[PDB]
Design a protein around this ligand. Structure first.
Ligand SMILES: CCCCCCCCCCCCCCCCCC(=O)OC[C@H](COP(=O)(O)OC[C@H](O)CO)OC(=O)CCCCCCCCCCCCCCC
Ligand SMILES: CCCCCCCCCCCCCCCCCC(=O)OC[C@H](COP(=O)(O)OC[C@H](O)CO)OC(=O)CCCCCCCCCCCCCCC
Ligand SMILES: CC(C)CCC[C@@H](C)[C@H]1CC[C@H]2[C@@H]3CC=C4C[C@@H](OC(=O)CCC(=O)O)CC[C@]4(C)[C@H]3CC[C@]12C
Ligand SMILES: CC(C)CCC[C@@H](C)[C@H]1CC[C@H]2[C@@H]3CC=C4C[C@@H](OC(=O)CCC(=O)O)CC[C@]4(C)[C@H]3CC[C@]12C
Ligand SMILES: CC(C)=C[C@H]1[C@H](C(=O)Nc2ccc(-c3ncccn3)c(Br)n2)C1(C)C
Ligand SMILES: CC(C)=C[C@H]1[C@H](C(=O)Nc2ccc(-c3ncccn3)c(Br)n2)C1(C)C
Lengths: 470, 470
């Protein structure tokens, strides 16, 4: 009863953050009709969360070492819960932007500490292997359960959708309080100069990337904010050399296989993120299931992924992470190919749409566990903080980058086959068929990116003794 | 009975050609002990057969039209059969070389006509699909049965090995005589100047490549012969513009998907060729099975190959060649990955060495049939001759090229891990472990080549209406 309570508490922020993002996206169209925030404000509610979530993410990595990882986890989750309540009672656009800024700060504080708690709370061995599976298992639960909740309690009001996090947030705080123990180690002085430059460099980069399309890539404020990011980034590296308790220990990333493992997650995260966002759009637009039905139809993915994580936790003590990652990705590669050849509009559900999802889910579940274990292997307690933060940012950073390329490919072929750029509802059913074949074509590009991840995963070379089995 | 006799007769030369090459390589060591032809003579017996087999191949494409395909086939097999008897009673080195040269001339005339008879004898539809399966099926039966025969009666004398072709050749001549019909059409005059230059251009290039390693790549005769090959090639193309009944119709090869198809066969043949040669060497040297046991152990591959060919023949009329080629290659890709990870020395036979061979066999069987059908699609009768000849040359030419790269990689890593270059009988059993890991490392390189074939097979774009089902 103490072990199940501990694992659930550590992964709580993963469930909340993933679920919040899915619920926010689903409710965007209805927020217009009530607040009337125009198209410009449509994207600000989304970028507002990401502006502070990514800008302050590396600050939260080192924050646990100077304050305490348990007291940082509770504070991060508590602030996130309070922000949801405020977000649900926003009377104008202004209140909603500040409400979303607060959520990003709360997620930035807690998300890196959640992964760092896995390494320190559980000793290396079977305990850590099971904890990692539960950590990754409920990241997918939040995504699917968001679709069900967001698509169900949205025909009454969008405000109630944001209130669903309060019952969940309260439980995780209670479990974390009554299941986690505070380590008795002396606190470490925070890196002042290195931290401010890192926060200023990351936030400026995200602002310029987000505002670029709105104002144009060469507007003047886009590259104008890009200049600050480069100046901030440059200064950050120089003062890191003579930094005590470094925010980013660059010396820790040498020509060894640490770069390979951290490069795989960056591109692997991009493949995963672009795969869910495209599949979600395809189901809603081309097949027209709607939000509630799509969420219920993806329940087998969670069950299928649960099997993959459960099996991989046992095998990770006997096979190296190299073979498991390749073995898991081999099943996923077959799933994408089948969906790229026999996935036209009008097919039934159980024969055609369920099987590739189930097989794809098992393949992903098998490969997630070995990668996470090797990312936090052979670090220690005085550098697990920053290393955990770097692992998650690369996973999050790879999402938008790969997705941008895929969406560009989708649009280009839509016009080639005969198509129109705009809302799907105004389509003559011959332009729609072009959109259907554009999405199927894009699935080949995602598969191509998966091959690169597999190829670069052959260089990892970790043995099962190091990552686990101790 | 009539149909069965026709398909067997047409594919006869594939069985003989593949069996003869496998038997010759096995009996090379003893030909030294009796004839005493020295190390220099070791390669002339092999290169003699390939010098004329590749030199005269393009002349045999257009021979069928000027005299007749049935008569050309019988003449080609007959001269091959007579040469084997003369090869079996060679007095010394000299008599053996002319014995091997004659076999190459006979196989050059009959092999291109064998594939042409498939297109012109069976109308497009289920008949052709079945005929294509048998044509590719007996290529593997000859390969495996060569090892058994070459390892079974090699302990008494190498002269009995070459006489095994005589009983098989005599049956195939009888079947072709009483099962194939002579076509009643007017003959087309043979291209004198174009044919002569092509034989000179191709023969000189093969000679230069073969003798280069012996005398060095910059000896003077190596590049000296290469100049003659280049001079012949340019003269061949210039005259070929104003040629009647052209030997090589370049105009037939345009930017359409014929180049993509013919490019895949060139590289696909290399992957297939390098896979059997390397696997045979690994089995004999590392596992120490011996020739007879290796031949008997590869029987499941033939049965697995037969199942893949049979299934693909039925599916080719419902699914395009693009998906079948990818589907078959996907199974093979998994088989080679498994071998690259769990194929150390001393593993048992049934669980480890059989299953990857069986799975790989089905993958290859599925992919060859769609590729063969698409290679002879949309051609006609007045140009089937040269097109079939080009298909075989590209398949055979891709073998040595890809194999040379793979062998260099295996040799380089053997020294890296600690080993020696030389006979495998004088290794320390620590130097042999390095060789074992080198072979499995090379298998990944073959997988890299296989991926490129799949990537370039996505551009085929033939519908099932064109290649079959008509
Ligand atoms: C990486 C390790 C790092 C460790 C560093 C530390 C961190 C460790 C944890 C990592 C967690 C990653 C796993 C989570 C996966 C995310 C996806 C998910 O949990 O949820 C499922 C999602 C449903 O979508 P959602 O509802 O989430 O969408 C939201 C929209 O925003 C709403 O609109 O996707 C899928 O089902 C995946 C199926 C894939 C199978 C292959 C496809 C076959 C083809 C079928 C036809 C499709 C058309 C063709 C193709 C176009
Ligand atoms: C494309 C056509 C276009 C149309 C053009 C028209 C023409 C069409 C013809 C197409 C030809 C294809 C069929 C014939 C294939 C021939 C291969 C064969 O039927 O024969 C078995 C062979 C063994 O070779 P042999 O014994 O014959 O060689 C003897 C040496 O010569 C002695 O010196 O291959 C295999 O076993 C297959 C292996 C597949 C699975 C992958 C391996 C898994 C790992 C296992 C452990 C190995 C060690 C690790 C790896 C190192
Ligand atoms: C006529 C149709 C059927 C052909 C369409 C398929 C090919 C043109 C696709 C198949 C695989 C694709 C490749 C698959 C993967 C990649 C990885 C991708 O690599 C990345 O750098 C990821 C993006 C990034 O993070 O920058 C670049 C494109 C490329 C080479 C793709 C190029 C286009 C290819 C060859
Ligand atoms: C050191 C260990 C732990 C890693 C294994 C080495 C990998 C880094 C190798 C294995 C697969 C290799 C690739 C496999 C295949 C190719 C195709 C190869 O292209 C050809 O095969 C051309 C053949 C021809 O001449 O026609 C070029 C190298 C490349 C990219 C290889 C690059 C190096 C890779 C990734
Ligand atoms: C050269 C080579 C042998 C490539 C391997 C590719 C692969 O499948 N590579 C792979 C392996 C794992 C993951 C993954 N999937 C989800 C989450 C995290 N990682 C991914 Br995208 N791709 C294939 C099976 C073709
Ligand atoms: C980009 C992409 C989707 C690649 C496909 C590769 C493939 O598997 N490609 C392939 C397909 C067929 C054959 C074959 N095999 C034997 C005889 C004839 N053809 C071969 Br070598 N490779 C994989 C399954 C990774």
């Amino acid at each position: 009863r103490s072990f199940i309570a501990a694992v659930i508490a550590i992964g709580g922020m993963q469930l909340l953050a993933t679920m919040d993002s899915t619920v926010a996206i689903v409710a965007l169209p209805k927020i217009q009709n009530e607040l009337s925030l125009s198209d410009a404000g449509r994207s600000w509610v989304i970028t507002a969360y990401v502006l502070t979530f990514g800008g302050l993410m590396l600050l939260g990595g080192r924050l646990g070492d100077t304050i305490g990882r348990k007291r940082t986890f509770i504070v991060g989750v508590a602030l996130f819960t309070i922000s949801s309540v405020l977000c649900a009672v926003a009377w104008d656009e202004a209140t909603l932007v500040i409400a979303r800024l607060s959520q990003g700060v709360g997620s930035a504080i807690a998300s890196p500490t959640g992964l760092a708690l896995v390494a320190t709370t559980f000793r290396k061995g079977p305990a850590r292997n099971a904890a990692t599976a539960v950590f990754a298992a409920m990241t997918a639960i939040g995504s699917v359960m968001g679709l069900v909740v967001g698509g169900a309690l949205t025909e009454v009001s969008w405000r109630w959708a944001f209130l669903v996090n309060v019952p969940i947030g309260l439980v995780m705080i209670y479990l974390a309080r009554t299941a986690l123990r505070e380590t008795n180690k002396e606190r470490m002085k925070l890196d002042a100069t290195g931290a401010i430059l890192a926060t200023l460099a990351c936030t400026a980069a995200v602002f310029a990337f987000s505002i670029g399309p709105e104002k144009g890539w060469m507007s003047g404020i886009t590259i104008g904010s890009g200049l600050v990011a480069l100046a901030a980034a440059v200064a950050f590296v120089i003062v890191e050399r003579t930094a005590e308790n470094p925010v980013v220990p660059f010396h820790l990333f040498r020509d060894r296989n640490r770069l390979v493992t951290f490069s795989a997650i960056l591109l692997a995260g991009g493949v995963m993120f672009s795969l869910t966002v495209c599949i979600g759009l395809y189901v809603q637009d081309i097949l027209g299931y709607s939000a509630l039905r799509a969420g219920v139809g993806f329940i087998p993915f969670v069950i299928a992924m649960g099997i993959g994580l459960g099996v991989s936790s046992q095998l990770v003590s006997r096979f190296s992470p190299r073979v498991l990652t390749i073995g898991g990705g081999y099943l996923l590669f077959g799933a994408m190919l089948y969906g790229s050849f026999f996935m036209h509009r009008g097919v039934p559900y159980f024969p055609n749409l369920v099987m590739p999802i189930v097989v794809g889910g098992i393949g992903i579940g098998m490969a997630v566990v070995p990668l996470t274990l090797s990312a936090i292997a052979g670090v220690g307690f005085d550098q697990i903080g920053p290393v955990s933060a770097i692992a998650l940012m690369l996973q999050s950073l790879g999402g938008p980058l790969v997705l941008a390329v895929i969406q560009a490919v989708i649009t280009s072929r839509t016009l080639y086959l005969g198509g129109t750029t705009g809302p799907v509802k105004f389509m003559n059913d011959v332009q729609l068929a072009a959109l259907d074949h554009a999405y199927t074509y894009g699935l080949l590009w995602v598969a191509g990116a998966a091959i690169i991840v597999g190829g670069m995963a052959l260089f990892i070379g970790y043995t099962p003794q190091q990552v686990a089995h101790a």
